[PDB]
Design an enzyme around this catalytic site. Structure first.
Site, PDB file in Angstrom:
ATOM      1  N   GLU B  26       2.525   6.924  12.620  1.00  0.00           N
ATOM      2  CA  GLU B  26       3.913   6.455  12.500  1.00  0.00           C
ATOM      3  C   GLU B  26       4.916   7.613  12.457  1.00  0.00           C
ATOM      4  O   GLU B  26       6.119   7.418  12.723  1.00  0.00           O
ATOM      5  CB  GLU B  26       4.072   5.658  11.190  1.00  0.00           C
ATOM      6  CG  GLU B  26       3.162   4.413  11.191  1.00  0.00           C
ATOM      7  CD  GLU B  26       3.343   3.514   9.990  1.00  0.00           C
ATOM      8  OE1 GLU B  26       3.702   2.338  10.080  1.00  0.00           O
ATOM      9  OE2 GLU B  26       3.129   4.108   8.827  1.00  0.00           O
ATOM     10  N   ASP B  30       6.689   8.044   3.329  1.00  0.00           N
ATOM     11  CA  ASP B  30       6.963   7.007   2.380  1.00  0.00           C
ATOM     12  C   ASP B  30       7.124   7.615   0.970  1.00  0.00           C
ATOM     13  O   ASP B  30       6.514   8.668   0.646  1.00  0.00           O
ATOM     14  CB  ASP B  30       5.777   6.052   2.251  1.00  0.00           C
ATOM     15  CG  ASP B  30       5.629   5.021   3.327  1.00  0.00           C
ATOM     16  OD1 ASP B  30       4.938   4.001   3.157  1.00  0.00           O
ATOM     17  OD2 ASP B  30       6.186   5.333   4.432  1.00  0.00           O
ATOM     18  N   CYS B  55       6.446  -2.457  -0.921  1.00  0.00           N
ATOM     19  CA  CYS B  55       5.083  -2.942  -0.831  1.00  0.00           C
ATOM     20  C   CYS B  55       4.242  -2.376  -1.970  1.00  0.00           C
ATOM     21  O   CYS B  55       4.586  -1.352  -2.557  1.00  0.00           O
ATOM     22  CB  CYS B  55       4.470  -2.519   0.513  1.00  0.00           C
ATOM     23  SG  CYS B  55       5.361  -3.212   1.938  1.00  0.00           S
ATOM     24  N   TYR B  83      -0.921  -7.063   4.994  1.00  0.00           N
ATOM     25  CA  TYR B  83      -0.081  -7.760   4.063  1.00  0.00           C
ATOM     26  C   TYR B  83      -0.763  -8.968   3.448  1.00  0.00           C
ATOM     27  O   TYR B  83      -1.327  -9.776   4.197  1.00  0.00           O
ATOM     28  CB  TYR B  83       1.146  -8.384   4.783  1.00  0.00           C
ATOM     29  CG  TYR B  83       2.054  -7.336   5.378  1.00  0.00           C
ATOM     30  CD1 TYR B  83       1.961  -7.048   6.744  1.00  0.00           C
ATOM     31  CD2 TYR B  83       3.000  -6.695   4.586  1.00  0.00           C
ATOM     32  CE1 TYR B  83       2.771  -6.062   7.301  1.00  0.00           C
ATOM     33  CE2 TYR B  83       3.841  -5.736   5.141  1.00  0.00           C
ATOM     34  CZ  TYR B  83       3.715  -5.435   6.499  1.00  0.00           C
ATOM     35  OH  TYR B  83       4.562  -4.475   7.039  1.00  0.00           O
ATOM     36  N   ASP B  88       6.330 -12.785  -6.611  1.00  0.00           N
ATOM     37  CA  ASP B  88       7.307 -12.500  -7.637  1.00  0.00           C
ATOM     38  C   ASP B  88       6.533 -12.585  -8.972  1.00  0.00           C
ATOM     39  O   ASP B  88       5.495 -13.257  -9.089  1.00  0.00           O
ATOM     40  CB  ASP B  88       8.453 -13.511  -7.720  1.00  0.00           C
ATOM     41  CG  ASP B  88       9.515 -13.311  -6.666  1.00  0.00           C
ATOM     42  OD1 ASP B  88       9.608 -12.310  -6.008  1.00  0.00           O
ATOM     43  OD2 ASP B  88      10.348 -14.296  -6.572  1.00  0.00           O
ATOM     44  N   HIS B 125       9.102 -11.603  -3.320  1.00  0.00           N
ATOM     45  CA  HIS B 125       9.840 -10.486  -2.765  1.00  0.00           C
ATOM     46  C   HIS B 125       9.172  -9.137  -2.822  1.00  0.00           C
ATOM     47  O   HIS B 125       9.789  -8.159  -2.427  1.00  0.00           O
ATOM     48  CB  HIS B 125      11.238 -10.400  -3.418  1.00  0.00           C
ATOM     49  CG  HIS B 125      12.000 -11.693  -3.392  1.00  0.00           C
ATOM     50  ND1 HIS B 125      11.716 -12.749  -4.263  1.00  0.00           N
ATOM     51  CD2 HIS B 125      13.029 -12.098  -2.596  1.00  0.00           C
ATOM     52  CE1 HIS B 125      12.530 -13.770  -3.970  1.00  0.00           C
ATOM     53  NE2 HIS B 125      13.344 -13.389  -2.978  1.00  0.00           N
ATOM     54  N   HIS B 142      -0.428   4.870   4.838  1.00  0.00           N
ATOM     55  CA  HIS B 142       0.225   5.008   3.546  1.00  0.00           C
ATOM     56  C   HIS B 142      -0.356   4.040   2.522  1.00  0.00           C
ATOM     57  O   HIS B 142      -0.334   4.313   1.306  1.00  0.00           O
ATOM     58  CB  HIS B 142       1.744   4.797   3.647  1.00  0.00           C
ATOM     59  CG  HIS B 142       2.396   5.799   4.518  1.00  0.00           C
ATOM     60  ND1 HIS B 142       2.690   5.524   5.846  1.00  0.00           N
ATOM     61  CD2 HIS B 142       2.832   7.028   4.206  1.00  0.00           C
ATOM     62  CE1 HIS B 142       3.329   6.626   6.288  1.00  0.00           C
ATOM     63  NE2 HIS B 142       3.397   7.553   5.330  1.00  0.00           N
ATOM     64  N   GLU B 163       9.024   2.989   3.215  1.00  0.00           N
ATOM     65  CA  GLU B 163       9.378   4.051   4.153  1.00  0.00           C
ATOM     66  C   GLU B 163      10.751   4.670   3.864  1.00  0.00           C
ATOM     67  O   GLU B 163      11.717   3.952   3.572  1.00  0.00           O
ATOM     68  CB  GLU B 163       9.469   3.516   5.576  1.00  0.00           C
ATOM     69  CG  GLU B 163       8.222   2.747   6.041  1.00  0.00           C
ATOM     70  CD  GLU B 163       8.319   1.266   5.766  1.00  0.00           C
ATOM     71  OE1 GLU B 163       9.006   0.807   4.845  1.00  0.00           O
ATOM     72  OE2 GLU B 163       7.639   0.531   6.640  1.00  0.00           O
TER      73      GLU B 163
END
Ligand SMILES: [Mg+2]
Ligand SMILES: [Mg+2]
Ligand SMILES: [Mg+2]
Ligand SMILES: [Mg+2]
EC number: 4.1.99.12
Lengths: 216, 216
Positions: B26, B30, B55, B83, B88, B125, B142, B163
């Site tokens: 990439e 991060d 994240c 992912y 939350d 979130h 990362h 990032e």
């Protein structure tokens, strides 16, 4: 607050508008803009001044057309925020999906008239949100407000939203910010004025829609 | 770049560290920090200076313990970023899930020794990411780097990453930022120095791990 017709015109002109939900709900203001022509530079502004969780409100018809199912089948969100699976743009110019360029591109592609499921990679870094069929009168959320503004402004049925945070204060030489939070009420209006944006409430948006549809 | 043992010590001290992946991957840096005691004020800094897509790298053992399935069964991400469904914190102090307070709380709760599935509302979130079992030597991302740092620093097996973007330049009175992008190489080092942080590469982290494990 600005009158809704004036907010609509600014939105039709491709500007961000600042939209506050009810104080009894989230009591938060979001930046809301039409997705169809959001620019790289606008997206960079949005990321800088918001939570950075850039979402894309769209209609149920678009979630079916674009094959974007709900992220979770048993939604535990207290408001029922209707996140679909996340996306990145399938385009030769996309790199990692997170830059302002890439996120703006995903939003414009979601809004394109010729959009198709294959135009999006899942998962990704932009979060589409399914507005309820009944619009703002049915669910007084920023998701509905964005889709409602697109309809009112004659735009494609995809918006972009994110919450305006209070980043607190810089602390020289230290990786912390003091007294952060969320921007509220008058401060949200002041933010709009500083940046040349219109600002309104979902309550007034519902009043506007009721002129034509009556109370739900 | 700082030597990995020095990066480990800073991480053990609860600081953010700046981690660059390979230029051929990439080419991004991060902010990475241990989740267990990330503070509200640290999270506000992280949101301000990053993409805002916060994240939480964690191990496969934690995704099973906490009941966090992959967001998508057929992953179309080119790197396979793993992912899970978003979360939350289920806590009386949580409000909308997006504030620095709320996101930091979710991260600390993901890392708590007594964490259980019911401690998280889905969707939400904060975005947990499943590191691969083989660690940084197996996937030079990362996600793995964060989990690897937690192991090396003797922390709970949950990190926080985002990032570092280039927000471009402010344009007085206009809702745009000029020339935005992603921070790269030397600029990432300069960012670390300005904020009193250690900075390193995943390549050097892999070299460190190889001292004990040999080349994969
Ligand atoms: Mg990435
Ligand atoms: Mg909202
Ligand atoms: Mg919300
Ligand atoms: Mg990465």
């Amino acid at each position: 607050f600005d009158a809704i017709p004036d907010v609509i015109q600014a939105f039709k002109n491709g500007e961000f508008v600042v939209v506050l939900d009810d104080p009894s709900r989230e009591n938060e203001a979001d930046l809301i803009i039409a997705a169809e022509s959001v620019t790289t530079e606008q997206m960079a502004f949005m990321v800088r001044h918001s939570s950075g969780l850039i979402c894309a409100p769209l209609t149920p018809e678009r979630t079916t057309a674009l094959d974007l199912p709900q992220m979770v089948t048993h939604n535990a969100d207290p408001r029922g925020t209707a996140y679909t699976v996340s996306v990145d743009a399938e385009h030769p110019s996309t790199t990692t999906g997170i830059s302002a360029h890439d996120r703006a591109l995903a939003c414009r592609m979601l809004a394109a008239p010729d959009a198709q499921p294959s135009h999006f990679r899942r998962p990704g870094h932009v979060f589409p949100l399914r507005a309820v069929a009944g619009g703002v009168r049915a669910r007084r959320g920023h998701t509905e407000a964005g889709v409602e503004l697109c309809r009112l402004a004659g735009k494609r049925p995809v918006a972009v939203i994110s919450e305006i945070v209070d980043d607190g204060q810089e602390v020289e030489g230290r990786a912390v910010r003091a007294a952060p939070g969320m921007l509220r009420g008058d401060e949200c209006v002041a933010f709009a004025r500083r940046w040349g944006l219109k600002v309104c409430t979902i309550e007034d948006m519902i009043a506007h829609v009721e002129k034509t549809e009556g109370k739900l």
